[PDB]
């Protein structure tokens, strides 16, 4: 169960 954290930056390791 996580709270809200929208993805706005690319993932690490691109």
């Amino acid at each position, epitope marked *: 169960s996580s*709270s809200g954290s*929208p*993805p*706005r930056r*690319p*993932p690490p390791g*691109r």
Partner: antibody
Amino acid sequence: VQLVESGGGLVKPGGSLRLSCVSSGFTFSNYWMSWVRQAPGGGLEWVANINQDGSEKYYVDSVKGRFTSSRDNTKNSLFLQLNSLRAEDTGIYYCTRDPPYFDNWGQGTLVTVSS
Amino acid sequence: DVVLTQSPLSLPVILGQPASISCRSSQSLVYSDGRTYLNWFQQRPGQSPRRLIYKISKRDSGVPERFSGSGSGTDFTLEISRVEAEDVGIYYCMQGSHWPVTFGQGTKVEIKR
């Protein structure tokens, strides 16, 4: 809440173009902003993200190195610099609020890459 | 990149009939925070897109109640309980769970009069 773009126009291939977006109706300093473009006869392609203070800027791979972002929170303004323009950069450039929600869009501005 | 396949792409509907637009994702689309960042946008003729749905099923404040969303995982649906003449336009699905955010081709809704 309103978003107004400007700066689109005709530019020869290889040339440069500066797009601006002025916002109204919300605390600009609190939201990430984003640019989305629409190709002729085509759909939508995400272009760029920018942080609240402009410290973080990310771009779609097809424009990495050619486009640069800037932001001016004292004037509720967002900017996009298009360099070394290719034909496939032609389209409507939309200023959108709060990726990945894109809850508000501008009316768009047209970029025509042509000699 | 995640590919969003919309079906059908052309949707001619008799006025008042229900309609359903499907959006099929190439990947799971459930983000690490448990949320599914799937949106639906409506581009009416001559206008910019405007968001209809965010997070699969949450409807925007300025959108009529006859628009709804559903789905999970890789299959999602935009439902129109009653298609009005003003609903003509192109409907896009969009994902934000994978980098970068990508859109579907768009479904052109047409009234069959």
